[PDB]
Specification:
This is Coagulation factor XIa light chain. By secondary structure, this protein is mainly β. The chain folds into two domains: 128 residues, no CATH class; 108 residues, Thrombin, subunit H (Beta Barrel). The chain contains two helices and 14 strands. It has an eight-stranded antiparallel β-sheet with strand order 1-9-8-12-13-14-11-10. Strands 2-3-4-7-6-5 form a six-stranded antiparallel β-barrel. Bound molecules: the ligand CC(C)c1cc(-c2ccc3c(c2)[C@H](N)CO3)cc([C@H](O)Cn2ccc3cccc(C(=O)O)c32)c1. The site of the ligand CC(C)c1cc(-c2ccc3c(c2)[C@H](N)CO3)cc([C@H](O)Cn2ccc3cccc(C(=O)O)c32)c1 has 20 residues, from β3 and β13.
Length: 236
């Protein structure tokens, strides 16, 4: 996260850190708890991942330094990548992880609702992107979970910023005209969470953009509302 601030314990309890364990253990991507055995994340995170055997999902983490050899985690039983996915920038950047066991919900780990049926035209004004990603192009994964409030940009405006790409209704964009706050490498797969009527909804999945926090280059997110039927079919 560029231009963010440190989160506190229990602030984003649906946020998880997805680690790989090979050839070293490191944070790969963010994700969001959406059910008792389900993480919603980005398909592009699984580049070069041979099978679910090397993954670990950690919930209830504030600081990456908290993760030691005795820290509890969930194994990943299955990786479900959207059948149309090929690359983040070409869309369908969505995946589900089915966990090996159920998440017991507490103040530090609980699900986030999907955008609700009937809310297709809601105007979200309180949206936040979170993660342990880079704060600049040549950085590293950050210790403390960062947050930044980012305004949504219309698809028509987003397309004008990305004339070389197809910005579709299956994408949603968020950024400041003058940049300064954005998601970046390692935030991918995590949530764009919007609070409406005092309830958080998972509106986007961090996916891609041109650089990080550049002026007139908003972040591009998977538009979760356009995949609710796909998610429900996979998690039913
Ligand atoms: C410019 C540069 C530093 C860079 C930037 C981004 C990036 C991420 C989010 C974001 C933006 C940019 C926009 N500012 C809005 O939100 C991503 C990357 C990643 O190499 C991509 N990647 C490709 C394969 C792979 C496998 C796992 C995780 C990631 C991963 O995305 O972390 C993988 C790089």
């Amino acid at each position: 996260i560029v231009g963010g601030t440190a989160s506190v314990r229990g602030e984003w309890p649906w946020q998880v850190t997805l680690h790989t364990t090979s050839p070293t253990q490191r944070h790969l991507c963010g994700g969001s708890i959406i059910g008792n055995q389900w993480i919603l994340t980005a398909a592009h995170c699984f580049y070069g991942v041979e099978s679910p055997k090397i993954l670990r999902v950690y919930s209830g983490i504030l600081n990456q330094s908290e993760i030691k050899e005795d820290t509890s985690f969930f194994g990943v039983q299955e990786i479900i990548i959207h059948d149309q996915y090929k690359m983040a920038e070409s869309g369908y950047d969505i995946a589900l992880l089915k966990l090996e066991t159920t998440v017991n919900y507490t103040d530090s780990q609980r699900p986030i609702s999907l955008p609700s049926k009937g809310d297709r035209n809601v105007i979200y004004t309180d949206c936040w992107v979170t993660g342990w990603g880079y704060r600049k192009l040549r950085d590293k994964i950050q210790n403390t979970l960062q947050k930044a409030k980012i305004p949504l940009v219309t698809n028509e405006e987003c397309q004008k910023r990305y004339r070389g790409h197809k910005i579709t209704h299956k994408m949603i964009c968020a950024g400041y005209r003058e940049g300064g706050k954005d998601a970046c490498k390692g935030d991918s797969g995590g949530p764009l969470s919007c609070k409406h009527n005092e309830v958080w909804h998972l509106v986007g999945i961090t996916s891609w953009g041109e650089g990080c926090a550049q002026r007139e280059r908003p972040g591009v997110y998977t538009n979760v509302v356009e995949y609710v039927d796909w998610i429900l079919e996979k998690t039913q």
